[PDB]
Specification:
heterotrimer; A mainly beta (about 120); B alpha+beta (about 170); C mainly alpha (about 1250); B: about 170 residues; alpha+beta; three-stranded antiparallel β-sheet; 1 helix; about 35% strand; elongated; C: about 1250 residues; mainly alpha; Four Helix Bundle (Hemerythrin (Met), subunit A); Helix Hairpins; 48 helices; 8 strands; binds a molecule of 2 linked components (NAG-NAG); binds 2-acetamido-2-deoxy-beta-D-glucopyranose; Ion_trans_dom (chain C); disulfide bond (chain C); epilepsy (chain C)
Amino acid sequence: MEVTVPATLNVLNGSDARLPCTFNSCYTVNHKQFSLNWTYQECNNCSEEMFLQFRMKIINLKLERFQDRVEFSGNPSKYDVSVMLRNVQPEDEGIYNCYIMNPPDRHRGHGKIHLQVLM
Amino acid sequence: GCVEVDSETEAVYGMTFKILCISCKRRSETNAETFTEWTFRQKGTEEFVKILRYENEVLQLEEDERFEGRVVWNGSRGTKDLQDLSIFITNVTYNHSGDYECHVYRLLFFENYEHNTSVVKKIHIEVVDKANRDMASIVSEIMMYVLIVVLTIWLVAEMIYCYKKIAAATETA
Amino acid sequence: GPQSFVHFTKQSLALIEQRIAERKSKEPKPSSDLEAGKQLPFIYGDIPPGMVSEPLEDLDPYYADKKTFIVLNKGKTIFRFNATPALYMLSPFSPLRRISIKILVHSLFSMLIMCTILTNCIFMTMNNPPDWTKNVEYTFTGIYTFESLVKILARGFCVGEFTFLRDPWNWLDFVVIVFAYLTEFVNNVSALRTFRVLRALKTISVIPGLKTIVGALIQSVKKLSDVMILTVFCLSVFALIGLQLFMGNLKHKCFRNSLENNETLESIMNTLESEEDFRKYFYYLEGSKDALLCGFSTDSGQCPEGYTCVKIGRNPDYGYTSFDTFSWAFLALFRLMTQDYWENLYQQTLRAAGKTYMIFFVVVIFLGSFYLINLILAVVAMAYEEQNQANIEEAKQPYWIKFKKCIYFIVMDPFVDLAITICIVLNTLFMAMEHHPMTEEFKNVLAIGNLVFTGIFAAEMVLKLIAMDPYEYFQVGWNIFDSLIVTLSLVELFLLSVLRSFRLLRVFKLAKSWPTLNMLIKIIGNSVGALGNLTLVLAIIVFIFAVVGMQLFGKSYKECVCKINDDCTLPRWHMNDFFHSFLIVFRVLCGEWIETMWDCMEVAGQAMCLIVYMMVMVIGNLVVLNLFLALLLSSFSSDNLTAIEEDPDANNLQIAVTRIKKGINYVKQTLREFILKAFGKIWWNIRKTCYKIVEHSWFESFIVLMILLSSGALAFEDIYIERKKTIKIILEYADKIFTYIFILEMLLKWIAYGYKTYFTNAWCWLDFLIVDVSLVTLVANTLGYSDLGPIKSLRTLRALRPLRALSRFEGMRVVVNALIGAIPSIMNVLLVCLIFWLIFSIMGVNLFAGKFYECINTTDGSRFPASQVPNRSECFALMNVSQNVRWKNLKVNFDNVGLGYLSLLQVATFKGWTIIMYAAVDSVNVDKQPKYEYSLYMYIYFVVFIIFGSFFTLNLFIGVIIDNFNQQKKKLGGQDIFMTEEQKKYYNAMKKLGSKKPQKPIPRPGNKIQGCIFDLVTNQAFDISIMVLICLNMVTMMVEKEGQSQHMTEVLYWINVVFIILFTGECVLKLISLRHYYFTVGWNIFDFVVVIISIVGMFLADLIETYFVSPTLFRVIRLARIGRILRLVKGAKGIRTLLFALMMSLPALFNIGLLLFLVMFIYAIFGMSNFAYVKKEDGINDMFNFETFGNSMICLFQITTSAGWDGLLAPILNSKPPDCDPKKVHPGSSVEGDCGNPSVGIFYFVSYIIISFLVVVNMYIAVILENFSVATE
Ligand SMILES: *[C@@H]1O[C@H](CO)[C@@H](O[C@@H]2O[C@H](CO)[C@@H](O)[C@H](O)[C@H]2NC(C)=O)[C@H](O)[C@H]1NC(C)=O
Ligand SMILES: *[C@@H]1O[C@H](CO)[C@@H](O)[C@H](O)[C@H]1NC(C)=O
Ligand SMILES: *[C@@H]1O[C@H](CO)[C@@H](O)[C@H](O)[C@H]1NC(C)=O
Ligand SMILES: *[C@@H]1O[C@H](CO)[C@@H](O)[C@H](O)[C@H]1NC(C)=O
Ligand SMILES: *[C@@H]1O[C@H](CO)[C@@H](O)[C@H](O)[C@H]1NC(C)=O
């Protein structure tokens, strides 16, 4: 599917970062089968860390590297699976992936955002 | 397809008789599994007594004198979805007179749904010495003959009158 | 004169400006021959060499005073431009403008633009263009910018009169160029392609003679104004009636009774999404997407045991089929008017509301789909006729020499050409013996026969080519065509499957001697000859529609695919690529648009698909109708003028016939000569008495009554006759009485008329045959022969007793007389059609013989893939392995020529054709499992057959039907052929109604207040206010919808009450004012009656809805609300005229309807006798079958329009197991077996559809005669 994400996002230290990820799927998002998979990797060839997932509801894995600063800021029914990172810290810099699966649409979606944090 | 015809109410002594019990499912394309039970109440008695049961291509008879060795199966054959449940009596006697109850126990099979139904049909049969002719046939034949004779007489009278008139006209000319 | 040629110089411009100044100080039409875009008159002769392609003065005196100049190309085409400088910079004498004019007026310019547009159109067909297409797209944009700049530079931009922007077709070029550049700079891609497709419309302005066709098509539309208004009005009234009758009925479903876990319908209906879970609570037939429909009456559909009928859930067909709102009701009524899949809607409505509502469909079909189509069609006929009349009115205003001469002598017309004709007939009959289960010996003999025929044809080809000179030989077109056929024959000899079938085109060589085949050839030639421009326009429109659909909805079909297909694969019909998009457009033109429209609205939205489909239908149908009319009347009147004699050069066939007349007669006479050398007033009075009795009116009435009784006695012999012992006995004895009475009638007729007179009459012969069959049946039954097979097959011939009613009723007699008069002309056009269809049948047999077999999984009816079981032997391995496996084949296919004829009949009528086309495009080979669209481009065969064997075939048929009925009318003095003498008198009396002069004005009343009322009600303001009030009432009734709240119900009720009090009041005012003159006008009588029905029906409906329980009756009397809106036809004069034409056409329609009903009755009795116990599959089910008289009439009315006749025929074609069971036991009856008789079924259905087609054509022409009579008088 078409996934609309910003290639690079620049966020100030201590400010709030909304991570936009929207997908254009023909079929209505049914919450009982819809799948959302948010991962984080330091580099393109680095390991991905699960920190948020929507299997039936929003499941926050609560990673230690993020403390309790990861929150969901989208709405699946309106094709929005964005998340927000409160009080951005320098180690939040990396690559964030939003994987989308919306049955009965066959293909798998993937949006990649490079979050750069400046002073 | 399937037609529910009523059983005849008159059986003659010493001969064979078939009692019809036809129960058609409301939709033909449905699948079911049916078995039947027959009950008989004789004249002079007020209690209905079971006399046979048919299920899974085998006929079970109760131990009763009036029906032992005289009844066979004339219903649906080769299937569990029975829509004809009629039996057949070989030597009708005077104690076969009475009213019958045909209990049909059909188990419909739907998608995630089983419906157990039941229907009852009542057949009252008369046992007499000689087959009484139906009123319908007698009266219908009588009206056929009277209508034929009336039409013929009317036509003949009309030809007579017209021939007399045209003969008078011919003599006048 | 011709000498008037001079270069446009500055002195001439100064003179023109001086003349303009003189005209201003002082302060007409031009020559159409000299009008822009025309040929220069021959009176001017040739052009001086220095004069061509140069600015020269204005020839027309009208523009001689104004500032213009003319330019001439090398084809003598004048162009009128403006002398004012182009944007005040470029002057006429400037070399830049000179070069621009030189480029503008040339052939290499138009050819270059044509090639560019065609290449661009070819490039628009690609759905996923590669990356090397963008440079080509820039090149196309540059070429268009070039021509736009040239035209702007040469003609000026906007300021002048003959300028770039004044041309309406130049706005399209401007819009294209600005869209291209602007959308390129700004960057929906699909939108940008819907803006790029407009370049396909530039073909109209570059191919010459297309603007004229477009203008004529625009003119044909403008004459359709009033008929469109009447169509909208009738569709809206029928939609309101259907909304009232069927609101919410298509949402009935069979809901299960026993629910566990304390569950309820309302709770369940909120937690159901998938059909897999809907199937657990509602009842679905296997393989059905929608739930089964039910009803609450005894004549509606019945739920299975354990399910109860409830109104809940969505409507069928994704929810698009309903009568819930006025919008969907109007869509359904439009569908009924166009008869697109209308049998499905008819079946659903009967299932959900009851069989008694078939009256609504009868009335709707007969009034809309017949009469309104007749009106549109006849108005198009007038428009083109006036166009053609104006056109014709204004248009009129040594050794080698020896042996070649020997060969030329060998060429001899009486025998050689006759021998070749015989050889052609033998060859086509020989190639008609191919079939699928063919032994190798039969194949070998067919091969040697086809080889020897080709050899002898090539021998003819070479012998002629050496007899006459090669330059002389190729002069005749027939010789050239024979040469092409021969060379392709040799080519295939040296070597596809279609190439084998190009030999059948030699059949057209018989058109030299066959006159009505030459008519079809001339029609086909005119389609690409005198009417080539209109056909080209139609092709352009089809291409544009296909590409527009592909661009708009192509990606939606792929992304939204799982909504319209469970396997998440593209359906059979879609618009993902150009070919399938074009197939959808062609199918819509054939008349099937609703089913693809449902998928389009599911994938891409309702509004877009609705607009696109309506526009495609309107434009395409209009252009196809114009092409049909032009072809029909051109070939009817313009082509045939008897310019030459019948075969002016004595036909070789006629020379052979003369030689045969000499020879056979002479030989027979010589043989006869050789044989001769070798060797009582009483009886006359009785006859008069019988004459007196038979010819009396009472005898006729008695016989008519007994015929009616005997015919009605046949309707009772359904499958339930054994529940009605008494009536069965009465019917038997009554049949005996009827036989007696008709024996007596026959004897009386014999004595009165005599054997000679009795047996010269055909009606008497029919009665004699029927009565003889009845007597034989009675004597067989009496003598104990009641169960013999021949006797049991004779007893089914009692369905022919209603044929005795033909001679008793004058309407059926005159309609039958007209039909028998038409027969002889129909026979020849039937023979031509059989030959044309035999060609296609042989081609289809060659293409598809034995390739429709497949290995299917019987329990679910799905073809196995081709990865597993790709062969017949693998299929047999799996049959002997898995039980539910079968290598079955289609019932209707191309195994032989007869089955090919049946397939072609199904395709031409567009009923059951889709299965055939799917099997054809999936075909691989013999004994090979089909693969999905392996032979995808086999759709071309079906498209070509549809065109040639439907469009042109029906064109020829109706073209001959027109002349036949015209000569029928002429010979009897111009009287109507479908009406009786009394009906003729009433027809005249109705004609004087619509032509009365203005009657005496109603006299005003002497009273003051009454005079005020008189001057009020008689004003036109009163009438127009009445019309707007009726329109507001119509809107109020349109607001009603399914599921509306009680507040809306109360509001609408009070508004309707207020309207009733207003209308009743207006009636009281008119009654007070006009006094007794109110009733002297029929329209006021209708108004008074309808206001009475409105009041009474509203009160009665309130009474029933408050103090009674009868929703059906409530709706039936609330239908009385329609009468108020029927008063709108009073103000509309045109729609009033069409309704008057319908009223005039009613009597003949009554006679033809009586004939059709009698034929339907006979076929109903036959169907009850034959197909009562056939398996309930395909179109035969629990409600639509031949078990009873009502069901049979339901089924026959459906296929009177040919709708769904394949679905009815299919269960009959089962003859052997495992298709049917010959020993099926039916409880309550002694009939055994559920098999059908394929031959009887085929004859039944084909004969019925043909007869219905003929009768419908009769009703058509009746309405056309009435329509043309009304408007042109
Ligand atoms: C029909 O198609 C099947 C597809 O599997 C062909 O396969 C044969 O299968 C048998 C047993 O599995 C093998 O012994 C053969 O060697 C296979 N054929 C080939 C060509 O490898 C089968 O041959 C086909 N039959 C015909 C008559 O073409
Ligand atoms: C039936 O059995 C009885 C008992 O003996 C006998 O009298 C009668 O004749 C039998 N009838 C037939 C038809 O066998
Ligand atoms: C019929 O039943 C009666 C019961 O009263 C019995 O007496 C009689 O013997 C029975 N007859 C036959 C033939 O079984
Ligand atoms: C009704 O449903 C409820 C579910 O909350 C259940 O507890 C209760 O027993 C049900 N009542 C009956 C009569 O089944
Ligand atoms: C295929 O069918 C049978 C099963 O009925 C199987 O056992 C056997 O191998 C095969 N028989 C024949 C006759 O091909």
